[PDB]
């Protein structure tokens, strides 16, 4: 029980890539993430601010996880992660009126392990412009969910499809959406 | 179907009544399975799975690690909340309410914080039965939306009113549907 | 500057 719940330290390291993820979360919303490849602090606050954060903290803390991971892999007889079945839902940020700017939201829920392909398909064609997704945000069951955004112009002739790919799926799942 | 091994670490802070009652819980996780946990109410490390049994004992044998985590509820939790008070905790975006028939749906979209209260009124009287509410929807970009619907029988010129209240509003928003 | 919690190594 609490009024707020923050996660000042969501650290991630999987042996797949190998890849990782460092994010700060407040009330289930991502404040910033550290690009572990580019060594940079990429803020997500929808405000103006002069806060700062050395990405070497993330690089060091995640490097401690890589060390601890190799040990727990040996102590567990190589007990690997179980590929969970993701849950996808496509909806709009605002009520759809035709001809006026809107944003499509693709919400993949219950993701584990954190490896996924999220691509938008307009009439069966890969969409590249105006698309952006979030980081892997932490769930309470220690799984993850991701969210992709596609700003578009809703008209009566463009059908859309969010295509998700995961190891828990034996088939690339497509989610439909019509204006 | 390739194999993958995951390790997580969550440094979580729980705030109640500002910084009056603050609780730190650091969780070490191996493939969704919490193995170790340092609870600030406990004061020391505690194993959550058989895996973390030698780790919680090894960490508790170190005196400085005990002090670095015991002071974390102030070094990490309380220090960051004072930054929260000057940014996120002052963020108030106003809801955009919309009525659309199908059954009448009320689309309250793009509001923050999550606290909100909507009600359905038929000719001034609050309609209770025949009202379905969806759970709150996280848009992921620091905004929420909620859909609340009223099963209805529209006769004559009955006026229907979606009445919402939100911390960003000093007076509530009411949209009508004749 | 926000602060973040740290992880410590386990016995190798």
């Amino acid at each position, epitope marked *: 029980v609490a009024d707020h719940v923050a996660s000042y330290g969501v650290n991630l390291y999987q042996s797949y890539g190998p890849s990782g993820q460092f994010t700060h979360e407040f009330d289930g919303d991502e404040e910033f993430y550290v690009d572990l490849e580019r060594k940079e602090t990429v803020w997500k606050l929808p405000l103006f601010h002069r806060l700062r954060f050395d990405p*070497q903290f993330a690089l*060091t803390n995640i490097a*401690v996880l890589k*060390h601890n991971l190799n040990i727990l892999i040996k102590r567990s007889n190589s007990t690997a992660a179980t590929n969970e079945v993701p849950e996808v839902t496509v909806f709009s940020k605002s009520p759809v009126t035709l001809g006026q700017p809107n944003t499509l939201i693709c919400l993949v829920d219950n993701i584990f392990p954190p490896v996924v392909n999220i691509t938008w398909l307009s009439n069966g064609h890969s969409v590249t412009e105006g698309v952006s997704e979030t980081s892997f945000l932490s769930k309470s069951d220690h799984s993850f969910f991701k969210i992709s955004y596609l700003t578009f112009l809703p008209s009566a002739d463009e059908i859309y499809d969010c295509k998700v790919e995961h190891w828990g799926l034996d088939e690339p799942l497509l989610k439909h959406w019509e204006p | 179907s390739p194999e993958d091994f995951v390790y997580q670490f969550k440094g979580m802070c729980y705030f109640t009544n500002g910084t009056e009652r603050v609780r730190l819980v650091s969780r070490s996780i191996y493939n969704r399975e919490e193995i170790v946990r340092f609870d600030s109410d406990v004061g020391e490390f505690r194993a959550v799975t058989l895996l973390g049994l030698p780790a919680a004992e090894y960490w508790n044998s170190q005196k400085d*690690i005990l002090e670095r985590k015991r002071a974390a509820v102030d070094r990490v939790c309380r220090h960051n909340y004072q930054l929260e008070l000057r940014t996120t905790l002052q963020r108030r975006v106003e809801p955009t309410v919309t009525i659309s028939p199908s059954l009448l749906v009320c689309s309250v979209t793009d509001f923050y914080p999550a606290q909100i209260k909507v009600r359905w009124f038929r000719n001034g009287q609050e309609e209770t039965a025949g009202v379905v509410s969806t759970p709150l929807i996280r848009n992921g970009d620091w905004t929420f939306q909620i859909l609340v619907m009223l099963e209805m029988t529209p006769q004559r010129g009955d006026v229907y009113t979606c009445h919402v209240e939100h911390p960003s509003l000093q007076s509530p928003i009411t949209v009508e549907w004749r | 500057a926000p602060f973040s919690e*740290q992880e410590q190594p386990v016995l*190798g």
Partner: T-cell receptor
Amino acid sequence: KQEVTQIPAALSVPEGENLVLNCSFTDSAIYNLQWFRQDPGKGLTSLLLIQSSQREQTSGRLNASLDKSSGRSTLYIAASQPGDSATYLCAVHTGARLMFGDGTQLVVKP
Amino acid sequence: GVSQTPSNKVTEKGKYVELRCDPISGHTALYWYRQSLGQGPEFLIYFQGTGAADDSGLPNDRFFAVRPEGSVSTLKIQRTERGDSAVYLCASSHGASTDTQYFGPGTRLTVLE
């Protein structure tokens, strides 16, 4: 940025004296304040470790203060012996690395 | 007891040197520092096991460190320089980068012209 400074660069004092060595760090966003002593053939040995949320740290004859809003930490050594004659280094921690001062040469004369 | 070899080292403006550090048994975190005359130590590198977690203190591509087994570390300095003359210190830790670090004696490197 961050620069730690130690004010008594050299200190030569008789036995049994109570003396004062202080540290000075510019930026206060620190995770730790630590005091060491360096001896010629053996390197540094830890003396104290103050957390961010603490103002006091008492241990033996050593007494350290911590004002992080004013970027100053002070070490008070009581009943100084010739045995604790060393260079006393003040180190602050910026979360990522350890930021060391320039040192204080202490010589307690018999 | 963390030990470093050799105790002293003297070279010229263009030779190759190596510094050895034996950490305390059981410490998976290892550090390299460098201290010049009248100054405090400077952070150089930080190994978390066999891999380096922080190498931002390394001043050149001429500087390289390696800890191939999670214990003994070797600090390699190629094409040495007069400005590389210092006392290089080594440390070890049981905890994170913020916990207590136990230092060794150091290696007095003096690179001559």
